[PDB]
Each structure stands twice: as C-alpha cells, then as structure tokens.
Amino acid sequence: KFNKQKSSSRRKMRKAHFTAPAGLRRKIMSSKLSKELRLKYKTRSLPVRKDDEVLICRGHNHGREGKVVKINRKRYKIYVERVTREKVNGESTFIGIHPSNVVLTKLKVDKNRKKILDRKA
Amino acid sequence: VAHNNVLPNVHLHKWWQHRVRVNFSKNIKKKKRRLLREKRRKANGGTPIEKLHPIVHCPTQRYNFRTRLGKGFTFEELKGAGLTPRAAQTIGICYDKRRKNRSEESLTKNVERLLKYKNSLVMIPLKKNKAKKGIGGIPADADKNTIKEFRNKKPLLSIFK
C-alpha cells in the first residue's frame, strides 16, 4: 500500500498468484493452527505439510477432522484422509480443500519446521 | 478565410505532431531535482550547495537600473578581498577571468560583499584537528568546539541571494 515499489494493481496480483513458483505456492498455502497451538507458539499460521492433522471449517464437510494425505500446489488444494468421494465411474478420490477453509491441530514437525517456529518466535 | 476574424498565422504546416512534448513530468521532475539537491547537500556535510556570485548591473537601457547575480568575481575584486583566484575557487566563491571593472563603486561593493562572506564563513581543517592557516586568501582553521557550535547554529543562505 504505502511502499510504491510493490504493485497494488489487481491484474498484476492475480498474475503473480497464478504464476507463482513452487516455493511461493508452498508459502501461500498456509493454514491457521488451533488455539492451543497458537498459545504454545507465537505463530498464527503455518504452511501445511503432509502428515499434519487438520479440521475443516468451511464447505460441505464443515467439521470433519483428519490427517492430510497429499497437498497439491498446482491447484491450491489439500486432501484429507476421509473426505472421500466416488467419481462417475465409481473410483474413490479425495475432495480438495483450500488451506483457507481449514484449521490444523496435530502438527508434522521436522527440523525445518522447528527452525521456522524459532524464527517466528 | 471568412468573417471578421484575425488572419490565421498558426504555423502548423510541417509535421508538427512529430515533435510535441507534453510535460506530464513537470512537478515530478521538479521533485526529483529537489531530492537530488538534498542528496548533494547531505554529501557535502555542513557546506552549502550554493556558490557565491557577485551582484552586477544588467546591460541595455531597459534593465540598467536592476541588479542581479553575475557569474564570477573578477581578479581585481578577488585581490581587493585579499584572496587568490584559485583559493577563492576552492572555497565558496566563483571567479570570472573575463569580467572587467569600469565602475569603481561597483568594485567596492563587490569587495565589501566578499569581505562579508569571508566574515560569515568558518573553515574546517583539511586534516582533522591540525589547525593551520590558509593559502593566499583562505582564512584560518578554527578549533573543534567552535566548529561544533557553528554546526549547531543554522547555516544561512542569505548571502547567496
């Protein structure tokens, strides 16, 4: 806003969003952590990895908790354990949820994650 | 051409569109210039970005009465001041080898101005602490406390106008 080096322009922003590199995608697919988690760490939001257990707030399944099977940076959607849905053929696939509509509980924690937490602190 | 209008004298028979400058950049350009000036001032810590110019009388029968800043002080005036040209150049003052004096009064005025300027100015030493007297015209190097005091006071730009 106040710094005239970064563009406000809507179109530009949209372009950036769509064409972001993988790292950028990873960064922007962050999710809110639970109240307890927040209390524990000065962190408000973390980029969600694989073995994180999440609770969904928005959508058709607005309360079904479960671990994340896969995250998709191409479509900006994470996939939960039991958000299963049969396709037309009958093949079972996961319903993709945007990280915004989800709040994470149990955290997958590696050295990198620890470092990130420390940085946040 | 028709009716009682002035005869058309709009010189647009050439490919004028090829050379239209619209100054959308005016105010912004000015701002930029100002910024640059500020930067320069900062770089030249304490010293004034502006150089001393002598008051001179404008030529022609129509501007004769008016006086304005001329570029450069003339050897004679420098001499009067008690300054070398080179020394003057090194300091704040512009020197003009080509300008000549035909007015004694004018010369006197110029020298007075120079004197005033000299009085106003305090010289920071070339090497730190080491207080040494100037060459030919340049005054003296003052001590540190004095310099500090001077700095604390507002640098006036009244002489340069």
């Binding site: 406000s8 322009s9 809507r10 179109r11 | 239209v20 619209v22 959308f24």
Partner: protein, 154 residues
C-alpha cells in the same frame, strides 16, 4: 492515448471501382481471412478509431490562484454552517456545535481505536456506522482498473 500506428500498420489500398465492392482500402495478397478485407477507416473491423486519442489533449486546467482561495474560503464557510453540512449528507443530528473545535490533545492520539472512541463520544457514532456500511463493490468496469470499492466521505 491509443498507440500512434493503431489500425494503420497495414499496406492495404482500395481496389478501385470495377470489382463490385465498396472502395474502402482492402488488405492485399491472399490465403488469410484478413486478405481482401476493409483496412483502416473507423467503420472497419481492425481499422483506426475516428479521432484517435492523443497525449497532447489538455488534461489539467489552470485556475486563478485567487479563485481557488475564494473557493476554499467558501468551502470553509459551508463547513461552519450546520444546515449545509447536513445537506451534504453528514449525520449531524447529534452534534451540539458544528464548527467543531476539539482540544490539542487530539493531535497526539496514537491509536485508531482511541480516535474511533473519541468520534463516538463526540456524536459521530451514526456517521461512523454509515461509513462502515458504505464500503461496497463498484458498479461497472472500474472494478478492473483498481477502483474496486466505493466509500462515502466522512
């Protein structure tokens, strides 16, 4: 301003009269759907617009400094006058004095919340509410030119 060579980058010329087609310039050659078609001219697909817009149009308007000053004065006067203010749309039913004068303590406020509270205390609660309400998505293509929201002036 539209680009200078817009619609006119073509070498198209008119076939003349005896071909049973209008005499607008036509794109030369063949093979393409573009070949044979009307060239420039405001009526033609892919033509130049009528009077293409130019940077040298007068954008700014010089106004007499004095005039400007006068205008400012008038505005100030209006602001002083409660009725005028009311007309202008501000919710001034709950304010004692409309030339609103507040203590220098205001110049030192450091928190938006505090400011809001002060405003509320003054009587502008309603006004504030209105302002809050009035952020809304603009009708039209403005949305696409960095003018997405419209907000009333408090």
């Amino acid at each position: 301003a539209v680009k200078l060579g817009a619609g006119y980058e073509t070498s198209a010329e008119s076939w003349g009269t005896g071909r049973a087609v209008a005499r607008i310039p036509r794109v030369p050659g063949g093979g393409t759907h573009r070949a044979g078609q009307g060239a420039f001219g405001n009526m033609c697909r892919g033509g130049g617009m009528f009077n293409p817009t130019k940077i040298w149009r007068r954008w700014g308007r010089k106004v007499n400094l004095k005039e400007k000053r006068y205008a400012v004065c008038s505005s100030i006067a209006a602001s002083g006058v409660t009725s005028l203010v009311l007309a202008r749309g501000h919710r001034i039913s709950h304010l004692k004095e409309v030339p609103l004068v507040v203590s220098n303590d205001i110049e030192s406020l450091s928190k938006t919340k505090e400011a809001v509270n002060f405003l509320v205390s003054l009587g502008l609660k309603d006004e504030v509410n209105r302002l809050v309400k009035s952020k809304k998505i603009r009708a039209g293509k403005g949305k696409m030119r960095n003018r997405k929201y419209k907000i009333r002036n408090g």
